[PDB]
C-alpha cells in the first residue's frame, strides 16, 4: 500500500477501507466518521465536474473557439438573465434528487436513478479509477486557470511554448517564480520534517 | 589511545569504538549515544561533501576553467539557476529521504536502497578511520579555500604557488595588511 | 569440500575438479535444472532475464548512437552521402606504429578510425537524424530507457511485485495486447513519426521537439481524415527530380503508394513506408480484438483448437489437447517463436537487399554485403535453435497420455517415413547437384564448354515474367499490357514498380540463368539436409531401436557406452551439433552466391558470373581466388595499409577454425592420460609443488568438447568470411 | 460523399444486424466457446455495452472504408 | 553537449582493458573457490 | 523559520528538559556575549560597510560589498593597533547626506553633536558606539561559570 511519500504513516483514521487511500490528512479534517463520507462524495463530484470541464476546455482550444475565460462575454442565441433562471431552476430539482440518493445509498446518482449505469460496468476498480482521474482533473483545472492567470493564451499553447525552451520556459522563470520555488523547497523538506518527529 | 591534549584523559562518553575517536570533545556535544551516533553520521556526510567539493575545486583549477570557483554560480548555463534549484531540491529530497530512512533501519550510510552501499567489498575499520580523517582534512581545507579567496582573491593552487615563490611574504600577515593593494 | 559456486546445483558444487566451473557456467541459464525449482519461480526468473536482455539491447543501441555522434562524421556524411565513407568510432591502440596511425586515418578524421559497415548512417539519415545533437539526445534517451528496464527487472523479483503463475499463462490477454498494443500502437506511432518528422526532414524542413507542435504535416490539417476524404493526402507527391534533404522538387503528400524506388537515393519512398505502417497498424489493432479476456466477447484458443478435427479421421483426434501441451510447455513456445523469428530474419535480409528502404544504401556495396550475410547467419542459428528446442520439448515436456491421437502424437507415429523421405530428397539433390557440377567442371577442363549441362530455370523466370519483367518474353499477368492484373494497377502502384523491376541496375529481381539454377539446387540441398538432421534428432530424441529409453537420459548426455556396437553421438544434442555444420555450410553457399552475383553486378560484368557459376573451378578461382588478392595484401614486407586489419582477421579466423578441429577430431582419453602425466610432473617438482591447485585438473567432457569445437568452428567461419567479404568489397569499391 | 450520412447509416445498419440478426448466433457461439466483470443491461435481448462497442467499431470501419474508396474516385 | 574530453580514450581504453578485467578476474576467481560452511 | 522552530520544539526528541531551562549562568553568558555583543558587532559591521558609504554617495550592496573597502587603509590599522587612523578625515560641516560632496573617509569617530544638515547623530559616531558596547557586552559575557 503506497503512501503519499516514501515512508508515511496513516493518521489512525485512513487505514485503507476507502479507495485511493494514501494516508494524506495533515489538517485531520476527516477525523469524524460522518464527515468522511460527505467529504468523499464532495471529492467525487468535484472530480467529475473538473473532468468534464477540463475535457471541454481542451476541446475548445483545438478547434479554435474562444478561450474558456472569455466564452462568457461572447453573445449567444439567448439572454443571460433567462440562462441563470433556467440553470438554477433545473439544478434545484437535480441537486435535490441527487442529495436524496446519497441519504438512501451513499453514492452519486442521476435524477431518480441512484446506481446510474445503463451499460453496467460498475466495478470496484472502476470506482477507484474515477477518483484518480477526478483528482488529476482537479489539478489540471487549477493548472489551466493558473496558466491563464500569468501567461494567458491557453493550455495547449502553454504546452507548445514549454516545448520551445523547457529550460527557460517554466513556472520558475515566470512572474510567480520565487514563490513557487520556495514552496517547492519547503514541500521537499516536509516529508523529512514529518519523519524527524513522528 | 592518544588524545588531542597531552596529559588529558579522554571523556567517559567518548570511547575508542568509533572510527576517529581521539577523545576530542571540550564542549561535550556527544554525551548521549543517540546524539553521538547521529553526529557521527553528520560528520561522515559533511566530510564526504567537503571531499567532493575540494576535489571539484582542485579539478576545476587544474583543468583551466575560465571562472574561479567562487564565480561558477553566476556563469551563464543552459537551464538557468532559477530553474536548477527546484530540480535539485526534488531529487535531493528523494535521495536524502531514502538515505535517512535507511539510516533508521540500520546505523550505516547508503545509496537509495543499498544499505550499506558497498560494492566490490574493500571495507574495514581502518578504512573507516581513513574516511573520517580525510573528511576532517577536506572540511578544514574547504574553509581554508573560502577564507583564502576572501582575503587574497587567489585560487588554491594559485595561492599555493604564490606562497612557494615568496615564502617570507605573501602570507596571512601580508595579505591581511596589504588589503587595499589586493582589491 | 563443497564450494559456493554454483549455487543452483549442489551436485555440481560438490565436484572437486575443473569440470565444476565449466558445467556451472554452461548450466546457469538452465532454470528447470536448478535445485528447488518450481513453475512460478521459473517464469519469474525468465521474466527478469527478459528485462535484462532488453536493457542490454537498449544500452548497446545507445552506445552506437553515442559513438557515431562523438567520433563519427554524420554531420559531414549527410551533405555528401555518395563520396564520404561513414566512421564507426575512433581507434586508441598503443600497439599501432606510425604507418598504422596514418593508414587508419581516413574518412576526413583527425586520427585512426574504423569505417562502419553496419549501415546505421543511412537508416538514421532516412528516419530524420541530421545533426550530432539528435544522435546524442537519442543515445541519452536510450540509456535512460535501458536503466529503467534494468530497474524493472530487479523490481519484479522482489515480493509484492512478483507476478503469479496464472498471470504468466494468460495467453488470450497477452496475445490480444501484443497484437493490438505492441504491434498496432507501435506501428501507428512509427507512422506518426514518419509523417511528422521523417517526411518533413527529407524535404528540407527541420522538425524537432522544439517546433513539432506548431508545424503542420499537411496543408489541410487533419480535416480530410475526419471527413473521410483520405484521397487528398496522396495529392501532390514527390516528383522525379526531388533531392533528398532539400526542398527542390519536394511534394506535399504524406501517404502515397507510388511504389518503386526514389530516383536519386535508389530507396523506397518515405510516403509509401508511412502508408504501409498505417495500414499494418490498422490491421494489427483490429486483429488485437480476437480473443476473449474479460468482457465476454472474443474467442478461446482452446475451443478453436478442439474444434478443428476433420470428420474423416485423417488427422486422428485433430488438434484436441494442443492448448494444454503448448501453454504448459515453454520449450514448445520458444521453438515456435524461434522458427518464426528465423524465417522473418531471412525475409528481412532478402527484402532489404532487393528493396532498399534507407537512403543511399544501394550505393554502399559493403553495407549490403555485410547486412545480408549478418542477417542470414543469424537466421540460420535461430532456425537450428528452434529445432533444438523442439527436441527439448519432446524429451522434457511431451506427454503421450495427454496428446493421444492428435497431430503431435501422429508425428512420432510415422517419424520413420518422414526421416526416410527427407533422406531421399537430400540424397537426390546432393547426387544431382554434385554430378552436374563435376560434369561442367570436366567439360571446362577438356576445352568443351558447350558440352556442359545448363538447365534454364524456366519456373523462376516464369515467376519473374509474371511480376512484370519483360526480358524473358512470356508476356502474361503484369507483363502483358492487355491483362486485367496489369490495367488494375496502372493508376495506383504499377508504373513505379514496373520501372524499378525492369531496370537491371538494381537488385530487384535480378536476371537468372543456369548458374543460378544450380546454386539454388545446392541451397535446397543444404536446407533439406539440415532439416533432415534436425527433424531426425527431434523425433528420435525420445527413443529409437538402438536406445529405447533415450527419453530417460535427458536432452544432452555423452553416449550409451561402446556396447551394442557403439553409441557415439546418440543424443538429440549431438544431432543439433552435427546440424550446425550443415547450417553453416548452407548459409555459406547462399552468402557466396549473393556476394558473387552482386560483385559481378557492381563491377558491370554479370556475364562473368553467368559463365563461371556453372563449374566449381569458376567459383574457386574467379570468386575466392580473384577477390582475395587485396585482402591478403593488407600487410607485406613493402608496408601496410588500412586493409591489414582484415588480413589479420582472416588469419585469425583460420586459426580459430583449425583449433576447433582439434577438439573435433581428438577425443578425451588421450588428453586425460596426458593430464595425469602433467599432474605427476607438477607434484614431483621442487620449488613448484608448494603451489597446489584448488580444483583437480581433468580433461574436458565429451559434450563440452563438442561444444568447444563447434564454437571455435563457428567463430572462425564467421570471422573468416566477414573479413574476406568486407575487405574484398571495400578494396574493390 | 457526405461523411455523416455514410457513417451514421453504416453504424446503424451493423448495429441493427447485430441486435436483430446475428445476436442469437453470437450468443450460442460465445456459450460453446467455454476474475471477470458482468455487464448487466436492461435490454430484453441482452445487447450489452460490449456488443454495442464491437458492432459500432465494425460499422465505423466499414463506413470509413466506403468513404475512402469513394474519395479515391475509382 | 555530452562530448567526452580529448584524453578520454587514453584513460578509458587502458581502464577497460587492464583495470576492470584484472579486478573482475580476481573477484570472480575468489568467488568460485569460496568454500561453503 | 521562527514559527517552524516553535512548532518543532513541542514534538518529541526536541522538547527541552526542565534542567536546560534553569541553566541561568549559560543563558546569561550567551545573552550578554552573543545576543547583545555579537549582534552589536554585526550592526557595527553594517554601519561601517553599508550605512556610512551609502551616506557618502557610494552604493554598497550584496553585489559589491566584498570588493569595496570601508576604509582606504583596509584593516591594517586595526591589526597594528593604530586605531586612531580610523578617525582621520571625518565628514565636514558642508557634507550633503547621500552625496559625496563634503564627505570624509573616517569610519569610527566621536565628534558628538548633530549633523549640520540632517540634524541627527553622525553615522561614524553611532558605528563607534555600537563597536564599544559590543566589546563591553562580549567581555561581560564571560562572567559566569558554565563548563
PDB file of N, CA and C in Angstrom, chain A residues 19 40 44 107 121-132:
ATOM      1  N   UNK A  19     -11.287   3.709  -1.032  1.00  0.00           N
ATOM      2  CA  UNK A  19     -10.486   3.576  -2.238  1.00  0.00           C
ATOM      3  C   UNK A  19      -9.591   4.795  -2.425  1.00  0.00           C
ATOM      4  N   UNK A  40     -15.987  12.581   0.993  1.00  0.00           N
ATOM      5  CA  UNK A  40     -15.692  11.678  -0.112  1.00  0.00           C
ATOM      6  C   UNK A  40     -16.634  11.931  -1.278  1.00  0.00           C
ATOM      7  N   UNK A  44     -15.663  13.283  -5.017  1.00  0.00           N
ATOM      8  CA  UNK A  44     -16.067  12.594  -6.237  1.00  0.00           C
ATOM      9  C   UNK A  44     -16.815  13.521  -7.191  1.00  0.00           C
ATOM     10  N   UNK A 107     -23.875   7.102  -2.542  1.00  0.00           N
ATOM     11  CA  UNK A 107     -23.049   7.490  -3.680  1.00  0.00           C
ATOM     12  C   UNK A 107     -23.803   8.489  -4.546  1.00  0.00           C
ATOM     13  N   UNK A 121     -20.942  -1.266 -16.269  1.00  0.00           N
ATOM     14  CA  UNK A 121     -19.580  -1.588 -15.830  1.00  0.00           C
ATOM     15  C   UNK A 121     -19.222  -0.927 -14.493  1.00  0.00           C
ATOM     16  N   UNK A 122     -20.093  -1.091 -13.497  1.00  0.00           N
ATOM     17  CA  UNK A 122     -19.849  -0.522 -12.171  1.00  0.00           C
ATOM     18  C   UNK A 122     -19.095  -1.577 -11.373  1.00  0.00           C
ATOM     19  N   UNK A 123     -17.775  -1.430 -11.323  1.00  0.00           N
ATOM     20  CA  UNK A 123     -16.896  -2.340 -10.608  1.00  0.00           C
ATOM     21  C   UNK A 123     -16.136  -1.579  -9.531  1.00  0.00           C
ATOM     22  N   UNK A 124     -15.512  -2.335  -8.623  1.00  0.00           N
ATOM     23  CA  UNK A 124     -14.732  -1.713  -7.558  1.00  0.00           C
ATOM     24  C   UNK A 124     -13.512  -1.006  -8.130  1.00  0.00           C
ATOM     25  N   UNK A 125     -12.916  -1.580  -9.177  1.00  0.00           N
ATOM     26  CA  UNK A 125     -11.756  -0.962  -9.805  1.00  0.00           C
ATOM     27  C   UNK A 125     -12.163   0.286 -10.577  1.00  0.00           C
ATOM     28  N   UNK A 126     -13.378   0.289 -11.134  1.00  0.00           N
ATOM     29  CA  UNK A 126     -13.852   1.446 -11.885  1.00  0.00           C
ATOM     30  C   UNK A 126     -14.110   2.632 -10.965  1.00  0.00           C
ATOM     31  N   UNK A 127     -14.509   2.365  -9.718  1.00  0.00           N
ATOM     32  CA  UNK A 127     -14.753   3.450  -8.772  1.00  0.00           C
ATOM     33  C   UNK A 127     -13.454   4.145  -8.392  1.00  0.00           C
ATOM     34  N   UNK A 128     -12.371   3.377  -8.256  1.00  0.00           N
ATOM     35  CA  UNK A 128     -11.092   3.974  -7.898  1.00  0.00           C
ATOM     36  C   UNK A 128     -10.510   4.737  -9.083  1.00  0.00           C
ATOM     37  N   UNK A 129     -10.752   4.250 -10.307  1.00  0.00           N
ATOM     38  CA  UNK A 129     -10.267   4.944 -11.500  1.00  0.00           C
ATOM     39  C   UNK A 129     -10.934   6.302 -11.630  1.00  0.00           C
ATOM     40  N   UNK A 130     -12.221   6.372 -11.276  1.00  0.00           N
ATOM     41  CA  UNK A 130     -12.954   7.629 -11.317  1.00  0.00           C
ATOM     42  C   UNK A 130     -12.358   8.626 -10.338  1.00  0.00           C
ATOM     43  N   UNK A 131     -11.997   8.154  -9.143  1.00  0.00           N
ATOM     44  CA  UNK A 131     -11.406   9.024  -8.133  1.00  0.00           C
ATOM     45  C   UNK A 131     -10.031   9.527  -8.560  1.00  0.00           C
ATOM     46  N   UNK A 132      -9.195   8.636  -9.108  1.00  0.00           N
ATOM     47  CA  UNK A 132      -7.860   9.034  -9.552  1.00  0.00           C
ATOM     48  C   UNK A 132      -7.937  10.039 -10.693  1.00  0.00           C
TER      49      UNK A 132
END
